[PDB]
């Protein structure tokens, strides 16, 4: 079905590990998209092909205004092509690098958007695993839009997969290499709410060794500036044993989040 004449291509939009990112139009229709490029030779060498499945089949079912669409694929000799949702107003990583911090009201907007489709995706036991700001993208009016679903499964599950970069989102189970489940998503809920109202993730270190350790023993503390409410919010999230972290319905009707977010459930 589709190639790569079937397409203009134009500026880059972004890199990942494996992901080169570009805005393109189909040239039948003037469809604006997104096509993200993969070298097959990359996948290969680090073995992540069931990753590459997985985030087609996953991506290309769900149907949510704040998860990113997946719209179809294609491959030629040396590259494979996933056609997607093109988010014109970029990442949330860039928003956070232009402002320094977000504002309560900011914040509170996009962690219920966040809880939304994280919500939906774990009604379907799909856990997404890999929640950080490069992954959070923007649409034309401005709504949160979840992507990159690589690294997602159903849960519960073990990790096969070598951990590629940082930790910082990570909860202490994941790192640790034990099983884990929907929780994990929980937990890094709450390392963006943090980072969000202060500018830094909180397990945030010189090293990965560092890291790791402040990880797995929950060493974080607040700015004064963050309210009593936060404080509430998001020491609830970051706790050691997965059980203890609350439901996705207890965050969307946690008194902070109520107070101070533009947008309902
Ligand atoms: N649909 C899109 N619209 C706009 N920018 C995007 C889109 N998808 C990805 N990007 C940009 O490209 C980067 C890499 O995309 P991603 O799919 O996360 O790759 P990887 O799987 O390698 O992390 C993102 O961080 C973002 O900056
Ligand atoms: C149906 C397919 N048949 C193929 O022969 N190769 C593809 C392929 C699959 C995994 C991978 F890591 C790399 C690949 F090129 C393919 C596919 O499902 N894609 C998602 C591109
Ligand atoms: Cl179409
Ligand atoms: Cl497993
Ligand atoms: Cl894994
Ligand atoms: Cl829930
Ligand atoms: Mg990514
Ligand atoms: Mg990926």
Redesign the pocket.
């Known amino acids: 079905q589709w190639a790569l004449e079937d397409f203009e291509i134009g500026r880059p939009?972004?890199?990942?590990?494996?992901?080169?990112?570009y805005?393109a139009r189909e040239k039948q229709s003037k469809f604006i998209?997104?096509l993200?490029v993969?070298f097959k030779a990359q996948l290969e060498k680090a073995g992540v092909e069931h990753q590459l499945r997985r985030?087609v089949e996953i991506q290309s079912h769900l149907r949510h205004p704040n998860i990113?669409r997946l719209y179809g694929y294609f491959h030629d000799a040396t590259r494979v092509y996933?056609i997607?949702?093109?988010?014109?107003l970029?990442?949330v990583?860039?928003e956070l690098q232009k402002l320094s911090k977000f504002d309560e009201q900011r914040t509170a907007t996009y962690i219920t958007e966040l809880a939304n489709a994280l919500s939906y995706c774990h009604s379907k036991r799909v856990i997404h695993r890999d929640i950080k700001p490069?992954?959070l993208?923007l649409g034309s009016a401005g709504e949160l839009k979840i992507?990159?679903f690589?690294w997602s499964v159903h849960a519960p599950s073990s990790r096969r997969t070598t951990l590629a970069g940082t930790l910082d989102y990570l909860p202490p189970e994941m790192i640790e290499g034990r099983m884990h489940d929907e929780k994990v998503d929980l937990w890094s809920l709450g390392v963006l709410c943090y980072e969000f109202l202060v500018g830094k993730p909180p397990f945030e270190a010189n090293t990965y060794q560092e890291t790791y350790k402040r990880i797995s023993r929950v060493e974080f503390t607040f700015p004064d500036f963050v309210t009593e409410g936060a404080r509430d919010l998001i020491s609830r999230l970051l706790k050691h044993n997965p059980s203890q972290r609350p439901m996705l319905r207890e965050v969307l009707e946690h008194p902070w989040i109520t107070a101070n977010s533009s947008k309902p459930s």
């Open positions: 939009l972004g890199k990942g590990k494996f992901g080169n990112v805005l998209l997104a993200k993969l985030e990113l996933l997607l949702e093109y988010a014109p970029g990442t990583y860039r490069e992954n993208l992507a990159d690589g």
